[model samples]
Target: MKEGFYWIQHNGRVQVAYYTHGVWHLTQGDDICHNGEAEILAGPLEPPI
Candidate 1:
């Protein structure tokens, strides 16, 4: 993914309250940096099962 602010969505809506980012911002996906770690925007929600 490109480096930029990514809007997180839920049920086809922009979850602004739950919006997340990547390495350049907050680590959520794979780390683009060489640290081998990603930044995750923590929120109060469970993953889809």
Candidate 2:
């Protein structure tokens, strides 16, 4: 799992939001955005899935 929590979809609260690779990435949203990344809790993983 590369440690960090990264994705385009998930079910939770909004943790963070940013733009990368010409894409609007949102973390921990109303099942409409990616999950909050653990890059901080885990490691700084790249190329979010």
Candidate 3:
């Protein structure tokens, strides 16, 4: 399982995004607009134990 943090410019303010198991999870606020660009922040994290 791979997990990592991503940055997205949503509505103006930078928001935190997540990527895990080939899925992109956006912040609650982003659910509405969902209009922003995302990029890897940390990157392919080690699987949790």
Identify the leading candidate in terms of lDDT. 3
Ranking under TM-score, best-scoring first? 3, 2, 1
Model 1 scores a C-alpha lDDT of 0.36
lDDT of 3 by residue, 1-49 (tens): 3566656454465666676665567767433322234434454545476
Instruction: Provide TM-scores for the models.
Output: 0.20, 0.21, 0.37
Residue 23 C-alpha lDDT in model 3: 55
Over 6-25, each residue of candidate 2 has an lDDT whose tens digit, in order, gives: 33322333343354443334
Runs with alpha carbons beyond 4 Å of true place in candidate 1: 10-49
- For every model shown, the clashing-pair count is 3, 2, 0
Candidate RMSDs in Å, in order, are 11.4, 9.0, 4.9
Off by over 4 Å in 2: 1-16, 29-49
Q: What tens digits encode model 1's per-residue C-alpha lDDT throughout 1-49? A: 4333444443343422333242333233322431323333434445566
* Model 2, residue 24: C-alpha shift (Å): 0.9
- Kindly provide the TM-score of model 1 when superposed on the true structure, using C-alpha atoms: 0.20
